[PDB]
Design a protein around this ligand. Structure first.
Ligand SMILES: Nc1cnc2c(c1)COCC2
Length: 165
């Protein structure tokens, strides 16, 4: 199972880890991708997860978008986890660098409640531009299922743990 996680609440855990390396080690039922509405996995967590699948995640995602159209900001879709997990839950957090409503971050985290346990990044953090301390607060106040957060950046991980209320 998951190892080396610091317990933050009854259901939220956190670790300084590369989510691709974490997924390969664990092979969780669900890995969360920090997706955009088009499922274009170019950079950040999405680019790293997609690159780990040898682009199979992007090919599957383009077929999904061709059939269904784009996701909503705050929405999600369940696709294959390829070599990383049983499933990938592609969740769209608001991208602050696109003027997207930061209030949609709570809606985005609500998608996690449809899964009993997940390996996930902090939504809207990184290249999405939101404050990761705020994202962690919304995560613990919204997600009721068991979430194992992987924070790539060690300095950000330390800041998140040391400032956690
Ligand atoms: N937060 C976060 C967790 N893991 C990863 C990243 C970000 C980006 O590089 C790939 C692995």
């Amino acid at each position: 199972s998951f190892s080396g996680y610091l317990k933050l609440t009854d259901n939220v855990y956190i670790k300084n880890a590369d989510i691709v390396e974490e997924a390969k080690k664990v092979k969780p039922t669900v890995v969360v991708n920090a997706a955009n509405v088009y499922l274009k996995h170019g950079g950040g967590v999405a680019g790293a997860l997609n690159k780990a699948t040898n682009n199979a995640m992007q090919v599957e995602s383009d077929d999904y978008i061709a059939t269904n159209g784009p996701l909503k900001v705050g929405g999600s879709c369940v696709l294959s986890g390829h070599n990383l997990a049983k499933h990938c839950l592609h969740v769209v957090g608001p991208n602050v660098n696109k003027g997207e409503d930061i209030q949609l971050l709570k809606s985005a985290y609500e998608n996690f409640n449809q899964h009993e346990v997940l390996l996930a990044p902090l939504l809207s953090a990184g290249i999405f531009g939101a404050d990761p301390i705020h994202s962690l607060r919304v995560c613990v106040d919204t997600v009721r299922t068991n979430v194992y957060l992987a924070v790539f950046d060690k300095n950000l991980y330390d800041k998140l743990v040391s400032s956690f209320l």
